[PDB]
Design a binder for this molecule. Structure first.
Ligand code: SFG
Ligand code: TCW
Ligand code: MG
Length: 213
């Protein structure tokens, strides 16, 4: 699989325990060989900036894929900070674990195998989560708005919870974007960038939760 290819390429070309080289090898391969839906370096640098700004103790990632953004975020996590990541594809999830294992980041991260819509309502229950400091939305684009409503519904957001959504321009999340921008429950900021491994304009939206009406 494409994802085996990427994992193996990292195992051979990256340095173990070094999250940077992991990222850089993942990027080199997808730039030069096989495009992959990693958030990539350009948008990733904006993620980095947002993570460094808010120093979340608990991040929820929707869509882990090969672990590129999990590695990207986890390396910036403070001591004791936890990243939780949801990945419904068991193959992808096994790849993500291997990547995070290789990055020495496996202790900061918990991989949840399942659909976000299924896993979100059990977060407090099974995973000892009160509320989320930060959420990275990067799974199927039709799930951004529904999983936001679900996260809100399940009491997983607090005042100042940061939602950071990838691909709000391409492939695009128009309903989500319309919703957070229009709602008083969310203060939004758009970060214009580029689709990973091409000249297509894409962006990240930061949507900070304000609490209910
Ligand atoms: N509803 C869902 N629940 C959990 N995982 C999902 C869901 N929909 C899509 N996914 C996974 O989300 C991933 C989407 C990727 N763009 C994630 C990339 C990853 N955030 C990265 O930049 O490294 C795929 O690997 C999907 O299998
Ligand atoms: C068939 C197809 C079409 C468009 C893309 C695509 O561009 C893309 C980019 C992402 O950052 C991303 O997160 C996802 N995703 O999870 O669906 C898709 C990728 C594949
Ligand atoms: Mg994406």
């Amino acid at each position: 699989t494409k994802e085996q290819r990427i994992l193996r390429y990292v195992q051979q070309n990256a340095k173990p325990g070094d999250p940077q080289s992991v990222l850089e090898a993942i990027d080199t391969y997808c730039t030069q060989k096989e495009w992959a839906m990693n958030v990539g370096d350009a948008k990733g640098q904006i993620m980095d900036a947002v993570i460094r700004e808010y120093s979340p103790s608990l991040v929820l990632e929707l869509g882990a894929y090969c672990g590129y953004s999990a590695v990207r975020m986890a390396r910036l996590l403070q001591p004791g900070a936890r990243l939780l990541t949801m990945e419904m594809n068991p193959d992808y999830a096994a790849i993500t674990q291997q990547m995070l294992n290789f990055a020495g980041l496996q202790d900061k991260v918990t991989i949840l195998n399942g659909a976000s819509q299924d896993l979100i309502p059990q977060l407090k229950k099974k995973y000892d989560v009160d509320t989320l400091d930060m959420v990275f939305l990067d799974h199927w684009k039709d799930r951004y708005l529904p999983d936001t409503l679900l996260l809100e519904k399940c009491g997983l957001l607090r005042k100042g919870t940061v939602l950071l959504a990838d691909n709000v321009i391409v492939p695009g999340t128009p309903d989500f974007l319309a919703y957070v921008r229009g709602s008083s429950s969310f203060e939004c900021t758009h970060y214009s960038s580029y689709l990973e491994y091409m000249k297509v304009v894409d962006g990240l939206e930061k949507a900070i939760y304000q609490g209910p009406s």
